[PDB]
Design a protein around this ligand. Structure first.
Ligand SMILES: [Mg+2]
Ligand SMILES: [Zn+2]
Ligand SMILES: [Zn+2]
Lengths: 203, 874, 99, 135, 100
DNA sequence: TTTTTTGTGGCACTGGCCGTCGTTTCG
DNA sequence: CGAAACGACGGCCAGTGCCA
């Protein structure tokens, strides 16, 4: 719940203060509101995996050091594999950071839709925000149709066993178990109700 | 009405005597003719029955209880009882203390069982016949002690229970007649006229020759004797409360006092004479003290003090009274009384019962006899009464052969003369009344029953001489036993828990500034520290943290009651206060204003955060800062932007002890660490009469002597009628009302006011000053050598060692000797030897502690120095 | 407090809505402004004594002067403690998919 | 931080100087450096506290950094740091005193007004006049 | 001496292991003790992390507790009371030699 | 426990200190 | 016609004077 409260601020800060194109935050305020948060390295659009694509291993390490200074043992290496050749580049070197510092890896898929058959349903939803025809071209597209809620068995197809192992899969269930976020509701849930002030001063 | 009284007795006996009166034992009694069912069944019947069944065994407790109920029912007072314990058992249930009982009331086993009385009357020598005389129909007068705070609540209960129109409190000089008329204040000669009787009426009053001196006095004395009988006006009685059956308006006329309490127009004797039920609700302070004793002990160490289940033979409790530590021990605080207990060395409760009873002008002569018999250095003989011995011994062994209590004489009369214990009560009445020749009925009556029992009529008459002698000063055991229990409870809390006992004393009398100052210095000289208040650790009132007494937040002067609570409540929901900034940003000026903040710093409650001079300068700056932080937070925001964390504390040079302790006096009411006087200890040594030791030292000296005394001035007056300024000199041992009358000579001419030390020559009889000297007048005046030798030094060596080492260093310094003897600090100025101010250091080389103290003999005159030149160095 | 504030600072408050008008206390203090005992208005429908449920008091204001009354609450209780609630089709879905 | 509270104005500005462990005024600092040390440690122990700062990168953790070299001050005492003193004046005193501490009182003194007293009462004049009285 | 100890006054006792939850005392224990009054004190041998402490709470006093008290890591002995072994009254030293 | 020459209690009224209401004036 | 600011005030807490 302390983490949930920090997420409530970080989200509120991003809109109220750091809003330009999207609602953005800082590593400075993340440092302030990192209490009770678990961090993952992120998708290809993230800080470390983008620095790796620029052939800049020196900046991604120091950026990993900056996040490792904030979250400590609450930081993790996010390893997600779709069809992308850029993920080969990234995941290979991410593995080295994971093995050097001893951070532990967590597997994910970055799903935007439920099943694989939604691929076109999602793709047309992109064309509605982009306001273009099915064959524009140059329309807001996603690189594939692999962005869905995959089966545990189906994850191994993307992440081979004699290469990754079981640590990405097992950590996924361990972190899910340890995320004990109970919002105050049910037999819980107290009333945050104000007093008012006072007369003068009486009951 | 009589049956429900029996139920409550049978129910009561079970809980008061667990090991003896059990469910099993009650069933048995039913068989010779749920626990509550048995008491119910025993009530039903019936006198004829109970009668047939006709140390303290299980059968004896019943017979006693059964006999008292028989008397109470027959005389027609079961209803009177049921009313009494109702409001007492209500008081217990609603958090109001009830005493063990006063008067004869404690003698009844029924009263004890049910819950009016809370002392075992059959364990001690208490009698029901003393309480209610079975052979005479007279209403018993039950008086009950309560906590002085919660006394009105128990009267308020009665007013709602028995009706507002049927319940109300009862309504209530020669010297004044001469003065009070003249007053409508100075006299000055009018007091010398009324000092002739310090009062008995002028009807009698042999210095009446003053009348015929002046014609003014002729009338005034004749007029004053005519206005004596008036009883002043009307007012409320402390304990008096009446509960009539029918509305009071029908018989007794009423009033309402200034506090709105309903008051009877008749007095006690007039209300009783009409035959109305009267009750005395007394307000005791010991019960109030014992309430705070239980809460602090439970708060400190998690112990539930059950006063009614304490062991009566605790070794630490008695050996504490044996050491004369009766500082706050109930019924035992008097000077001579304290000395009497240390000599006596009490070991059982009966020693305190006898001591308290004997200690008063009259039976006090028997105390020394009691102490030697008690300590085991004088045989207890009854050789004067050999035949009567067997009856006297079991009665008098408890008190070592001394007829102390009234119950003993009743027992001695009942057993030896064969009287009924009811009519042995009547015999006590006759001996007190001293009826000319009526007690000669009791003499011959005693002799007849005496010789039928065995006494040969030579002893019988002389035995009666003994009784009538001790009957004059015979005290009531029931009352003494009950009140002695509260003394023992008081002593018990002190012995085992001395810190919280001292903190209780401070808590009870927290408003009186003189007592607090006394209680602190008693605690400081007992190994128990007494710290100032603290926002982090102190509670509302006095508190015991670990083994240290700690001042409350309420004790701070300018800090509000709401503020005291608000500060405390903020700390609980949040954390402990981390800094000054954290304090005043969490607690706005709204609640804790600047006036209260300043007084909190002066008191020392914010000492954890830093220096007081620095904190006092940092107030307004941080108040602006704290005001600005809210304005930011009251507009979205979050933290880093909303707060530039508290600046460094606004620098300031530290306070000197004079002004620091002066602020402490303003913050709380009295100084923190005793002092200041002893900061310059050169003068403390001189002290010819310490404030405490003044009475002890001055009385054994010539008629109205003179003596020099130092301390600190704490009062401002000047003149005129002249120069008549009343200042108060205060020491670490106390203070005195010093005049400031002789100064109009003129003149001592102080102009010193508060916060400066002085030395004062004064005459004593009250004290009357004559000459005065400030600190620099003392320090400049020619000094003298003073050695402080211990008792340990033999005379037939012969003490030539001290004389040899003083010979080698001649000069011109008087040598003083402080001999700490077995009892009293002696003062000894030397003889011929005058030191030359080199022998100080060369003497400290050996095992002696020398000083360069101011010469006492010099303090006089107004030249040579002089007083002008003694103001120059200051 | 804010209803009495509204009246004094030129903001017309409505006589009440929902079950709020049922309470005499509400009427007396001035939340609602219609005599509940004159008409057949009952307290027990507003607050059921035999059930601890928080009563929801809705108040009608002038549509011009409504933002002022909210502003009063923002200033009074704290800017960080006062905010308005957020509010998030079959035909629309068909057409957009048709495009 | 208990010392940092005792702060009697300019009192602790010298206190931070006197029992030191600094580095010749200390680069980028500050005084005290013993304010940071317990922030690094995080009292009492406490495992999830002294790791924090070492992982980003009481006394041994403080010695583990650190701006040591210099070596200035020691105690806690040490120093640095018509009648009158006199004679002249050093100290050590050359007329009165001391069986010091008294020494220390003559070094903070100079100069050059007499009396006063300040702080305030009240024996520096007396000991002076008494010292002149023995020619 | 031993011969005194074995014949001396026998105060009640309950030995308690360091393993102790907050929701076990002091209501359940004091209730069992209050129901049986007597003239002997009670003690608490707390076998702690380092060293054997003794918290002799208060007059509480009954020989049925043993059965319910061993239903746990705690045991009840009738030892010669540690908090005594001082003073020179009440007993005393003579009346400790008498029953031997 | 009651009487005396005394102290202390407990309550009531005044006064000094921080946020409130009303009128008035200007935008 | 509404807001702002000054001016007069109100309420509470604390001390201090004498009541059983
Ligand atoms: Mg009475
Ligand atoms: Zn992404
Ligand atoms: Zn994503």
């Amino acid at each position: 719940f302390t983490g949930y409260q920090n997420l409530v601020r970080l989200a509120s800060r991003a809109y109220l203060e750091g809003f330009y194109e999207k609602p953005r935050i800082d590593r400075e305020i993340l440092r302030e509101h990192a209490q009770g948060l678990i961090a993952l390295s992120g998708c290809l659009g993230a800080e470390i995996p983008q620095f790796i694509l620029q052939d800049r291993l020196d900046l991604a390490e120091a950026r990993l050091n900056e996040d490792l200074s904030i979250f400590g043992d609450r930081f993790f290496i996010e390893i997600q594999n779709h069809g992308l050749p850029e993920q080969k580049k990234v995941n290979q070197v991410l593995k080295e950071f994971a093995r050097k510092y001893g951070l532990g890896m967590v597997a994910t898929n970055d799903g935007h839709y439920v099943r694989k058959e939604d691929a076109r349903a999602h793709e047309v939803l992109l064309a509605i925000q982009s306001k273009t025809t099915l064959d524009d071209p140059e329309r807001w597209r996603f690189p594939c149709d692999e962005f869905y809620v995959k089966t545990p068995e189906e994850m191994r197809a993307m992440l081979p066993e004699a290469e990754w192992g079981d640590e990405p899969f097992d950590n996924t269930v361990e972190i899910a178990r340890m995320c004990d976020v109970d919002l105050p509701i049910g037999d819980k849930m107290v009333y945050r109700i104000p007093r008012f002030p006072l007369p003068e001063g009486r009951t | 009405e009589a049956q429900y009284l029996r139920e409550l007795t049978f129910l009561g006996l079970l809980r008061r005597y667990p090991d003896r009166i059990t469910e099993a034992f009650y069933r048995e009694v039913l068989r010779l003719l749920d626990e509550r069912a048995l008491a119910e069944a025993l009530a039903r019947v019936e006198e004829k029955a109970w009668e047939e069944l006709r140390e303290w065994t299980a059968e004896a407790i019943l017979h006693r209880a059964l006999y008292e109920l028989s008397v109470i029912e027959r005389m027609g007072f079961p209803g009177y009882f049921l009313i009494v314990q109702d409001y007492i058992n209500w008081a217990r249930g609603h958090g109001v203390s009830v005493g063990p009982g006063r008067g004869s009331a404690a003698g009844s086993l029924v009263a004890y069982a049910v819950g009016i009385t809370n002392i075992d009357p059959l364990r001690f020598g208490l009698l029901f016949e003393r309480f209610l005389n079975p052979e005479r129909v007279s209403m018993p007068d039950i008086d009950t002690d309560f906590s002085d705070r919660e006394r009105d609540r128990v009267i308020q209960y009665v007013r709602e229970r028995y009706g507002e129109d049927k319940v109300a409190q009862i309504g209530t000089a020669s010297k004044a007649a001469l003065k009070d008329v003249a007053r409508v204040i100075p006299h000055k000669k009018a007091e010398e006229l009324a000092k002739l009787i310090p009062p008995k009426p002028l009807q009698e009053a042999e210095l009446r020759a003053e009348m015929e001196k002046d014609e003014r006095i002729r009338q005034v004395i004749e007029v004053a004797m005519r206005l004596e009988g008036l009883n002043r006006h009307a007012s409320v009685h402390a304990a008096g409360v009446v509960i009539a059956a029918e509305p009071l308006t029908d018989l007794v006329p009423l009033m309402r006092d200034q506090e709105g309490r309903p008051v009877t127009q008749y007095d006690m004797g007039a209300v009783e004479a009409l035959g109305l039920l009267k009750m005395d609700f007394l307000g005791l302070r010991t019960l109030t003290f014992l309430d705070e004793a239980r809460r602090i002990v439970k708060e400190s160490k998690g112990v539930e003090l059950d006063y009614d289940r304490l062991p009566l033979d605790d070794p630490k409790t008695f050996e504490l009274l044996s050491r004369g530590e009766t500082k706050g021990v109930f019924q035992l605080e008097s000077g001579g009384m304290t000395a009497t207990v240390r000599g006596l060395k009490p070991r059982r409760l009966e020693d305190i019962i006898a001591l308290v009873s004997l200690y008063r002008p009259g039976p006090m002569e028997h105390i020394p006899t009691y102490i030697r018999r008690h300590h085991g250095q004088e045989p207890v003989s009854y050789a004067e009464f050999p035949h009567a011995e067997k009856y006297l011994r079991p009665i008098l062994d408890e008190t070592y052969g001394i007829p102390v209590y009234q119950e003993q004489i009743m027992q001695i009369a009942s057993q030896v003369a064969g009287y009924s214990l009811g009519e042995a009560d009547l015999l006590r009445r006759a001996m007190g009344k001293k009826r000319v020749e009526e007690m000669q009925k009791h003499r011959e009556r005693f002799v007849r029953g005496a010789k039928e029992r065995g006494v040969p009529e030579e002893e019988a008459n002389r035995l009666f001489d003994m009784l009538e002698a001790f009957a004059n000063y015979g005290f009531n055991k029931s009352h003494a036993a009950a009140y002695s229990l509260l003394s023992y409870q008081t002593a018990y809390v002190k012995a085992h828990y001395p810190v919280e006992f001292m903190a209780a004393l401070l808590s009870v009398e927290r408003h009186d500034s003189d007592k607090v100052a006394e209680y602190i210095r008693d605690a400081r000289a007992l190994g128990i520290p007494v710290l100032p208040p603290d926002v982090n650790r102190s509670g509302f009132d006095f508190k015991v943290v670990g083994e240290e007494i700690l001042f409350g937040l309420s004790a701070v002067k300018n800090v509000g009651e709401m503020a005291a609570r608000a500060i405390l409540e903020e700390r609980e929901r949040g954390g402990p206060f981390k800094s000054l900034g954290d304090f005043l940003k969490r607690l706005p000026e709204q609640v804790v204003n600047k006036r209260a903040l300043e007084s909190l710093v002066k008191a020392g409650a914010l000492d954890a955060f830093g220096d007081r001079a620095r904190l006092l300068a940092s107030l307004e700056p941080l108040l602006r800062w704290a005001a600005e932080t809210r304005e930011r937070g009251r507009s979205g925001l979050v933290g880093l932007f909303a707060e530039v964390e508290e600046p460094p504390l606004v620098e300031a040079s530290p306070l000197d002890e004079i002004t620091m302790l002066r602020y402490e006096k303003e913050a709380l009411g009295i100084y923190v660490s005793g002092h200041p006087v002893l900061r310059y200890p050169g003068l403390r040594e001189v002290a010819s009469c310490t404030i405490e030791e003044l009475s002890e030292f001055v009385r054994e000296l010539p008629g109205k002597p003179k003596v020099l005394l130092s301390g600190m001035v704490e009062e401002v007056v000047r003149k005129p009628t002249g120069m008549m300024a009343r200042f108060t000199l205060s020491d670490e041992t106390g203070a005195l009302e010093v005049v400031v009358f002789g100064r109009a000579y003129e003149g001592v001419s102080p102009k010193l006011k508060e916060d400066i030390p002085l030395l004062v020559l004064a005459e004593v009889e009250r004290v009357l000053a004559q000459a005065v000297w400030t600190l620099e007048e003392v320090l400049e005046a020619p000094k003298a050598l003073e050695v402080e030798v211990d008792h340990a030094l033999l005379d037939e060596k012969g003490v030539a060692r001290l004389k040899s080492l003083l010979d080698e260093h001649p000069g011109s310094l008087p040598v003083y000797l402080r001999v700490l003897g077995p009892f009293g600090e002696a003062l000894f100025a030397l003889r011929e030897v005058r030191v030359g101010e080199e022998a100080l250091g060369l003497l400290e080389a050996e095992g002696y502690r020398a000083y360069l103290v101011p010469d006492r003999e010099v303090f006089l005159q107004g030249n040579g120095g002089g007083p002008k030149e003694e103001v120059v160095p200051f | 407090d804010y209803i009495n504030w509204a009246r004094g600072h030129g903001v017309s408050v409505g006589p009440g809505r929902g079950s709020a008008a049922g309470s005499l206390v509400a009427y007396a203090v001035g939340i609602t402004n219609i005599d509940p005992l004159r008409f057949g208005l009952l307290f027990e429908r507003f607050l059921n004594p035999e059930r601890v449920s928080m009563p929801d008091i809705d108040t009608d204001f002038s549509d011009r002067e409504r933002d002022r009354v909210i502003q009063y609450v923002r200033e009074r209780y704290g800017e960080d403690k006062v905010a308005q609630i957020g509010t998030f089709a079959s035909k629309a879905a068909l057409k957009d998919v048709a495009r | 931080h208990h010392h940092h509270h005792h702060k009697a104005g300019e009192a602790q500005d010298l206190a931070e100087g006197w029992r030191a462990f600094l580095e010749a005024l200390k680069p980028t600092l500050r005084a005290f450096v013993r304010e940071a040390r317990p922030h690094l440690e995080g009292k009492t122990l406490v495992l999830r506290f002294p790791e924090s700062k070492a992982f980003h990168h009481l006394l041994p953790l403080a010695r583990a950094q650190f701006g040591v070299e210099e070596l200035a001050f020691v105690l806690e005492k040490k120093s640095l740091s018509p009648p009158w003193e006199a004679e002249e004046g050093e100290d050590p005193s050359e007329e009165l005193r001391r069986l010091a501490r008294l020494l220390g009182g003559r070094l903070l003194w100079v100069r050059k007004p007499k009396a006063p007293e300040a702080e305030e009462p009240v024996s520096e004049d007396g000991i002076g006049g008494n010292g002149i009285m023995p020619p």
